[PDB]
Design a protein around this ligand. Structure first.
Ligand SMILES: CCOC(=O)c1cn(CCCCN)nc1-c1ccc(Cl)c(Cl)c1
Ligand SMILES: CCCCCCCCCCCCCC(=O)O
Ligand SMILES: *C(=O)CCCCCCCCCCCCC
Lengths: 209, 198
């Protein structure tokens, strides 16, 4: 049947976050969450509606959705919290869970007007824990181009301009079994800014066709 | 050639199968002022300047490739990178490949490889790693160009930086900067390995 959270039977997202720790977190620890996911069917969105927002060739949404499997595809809409003037640590943390032991390859493609501008590919081997395997990609340093982007977005004089800019900014994550090259999870991320007093939020959708 | 006492490159190839080799290394060198190539890689953290500043200086090499983009009778096919290192000490390696366009990093690929004992040494085989899609698309375009001089013009802004570290100790074992031109298929692929100095 049909997904309740961001995951399949073979690979579930446990946690995802992007954050910054101010220079003085060493003395009084804190972190600011730009976005955060911590884990009745999910609503769906037709994948044709977003093809233009990601690349369109090899490793593009259309071609990935063709390779399948269709149930592995999700869309997350984030309301990002950009209220937090620099020199801190900017990080991304990811955690997944499976019942089988695999080695994963996680690709994150940052895209501007649907054109890939950066990419990070990491591999992570399973860790056998409580009747299940865990995959930890914790505290990856954020790419500096993304840090710069955030610094710029945050200075825009109006929220509506932040949203206009973000209209053309997306992230595609594809997780595959490094050994078989099977797709395990594909997540498209689209962004708005949250309104200051509200922190980060998200809504997860299944991508259908 | 491309090596220290702790770690040597044995083979490196990038290729496509339906095997065509775009580049290939199978295993004193001239020296190049690393200063000359700072502008070919980002000045950020993981910048060639900053990596070199730490050292050790004898771990840094430059490879110039004259690539062979003459394949086909052509779309699809498997695009891969195979590398092999070797050593006398037992290690686990973190292999970072950074693809750069006009000095800015556009891809970082991180892989891990554990030593395996063979013929009385340790070998590290990162074989048939799927070439990232950025590069595959890039190569598909690059090959359409009607003249080599045009391929060369495009390639003067395209570089790769590979950093290989001892995962457990975080020590730099090898750092290689790659620059690119195209060869004629008559002449075939070629490379020239240099040492980077400062
Ligand atoms: C650093 C100065 O600005 C740029 O390089 C830049 C220019 N464009 C226009 C989009 C056309 C697609 N090539 N987008 C970006 C950009 C946006 C977000 C990120 Cl996170 C990054 Cl890395 C780059
Ligand atoms: C002119 C291009 C010839 C082929 C280039 C091969 C060298 C690329 C090294 C591979 C590093 C990144 C691989 C990937 O992540 O896709
Ligand atoms: C660079 O290292 C690639 C990192 C890929 C993960 C990026 C996740 C970014 C989180 C959203 C930032 C908020 C933008 C408004």
């Amino acid at each position: 049947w049909q997904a309740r959270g961001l995951g399949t039977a073979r690979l579930q997202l446990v946690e995802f976050s992007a954050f910054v720790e101010p220079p003085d977190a060493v003395d009084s620890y804190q972190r600011h969450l730009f976005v955060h996911i911590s884990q009745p069917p999910l609503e769906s969105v037709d994948v044709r509606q977003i093809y233009d927002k990601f690349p369109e060739k090899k490793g593009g949404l259309r071609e990935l959705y063709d390779r399948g499997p269709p149930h592995a595809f999700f869309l997350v809409k984030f309301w990002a919290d950009l209220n937090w003037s620099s020199g801190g640590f900017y990080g991304v943390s990811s955690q997944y869970e499976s019942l089988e032991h695999m080695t994963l390859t996680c690709s994150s493609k940052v895209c501007s007007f649907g054109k890939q501008v950066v990419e990070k590919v990491e591999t992570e081997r399973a860790q056998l824990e409580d009747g299940r395997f865990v995959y930890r990609l914790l505290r990856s340093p954020m790419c500096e181009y993304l840090v710069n982007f955030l610094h710029k977005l945050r200075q825009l004089p109006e929220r509506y301009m932040m949203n206009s800019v973000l209209e053309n900014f997306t992230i595609l994550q594809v997780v595959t079994n490094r050994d078989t090259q099977e797709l395990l999870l594909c997540t498209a991320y689209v962004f708005e800014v949250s309104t200051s007093e509200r922190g980060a939020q998200h809504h997860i959708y299944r991508l259908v066709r």
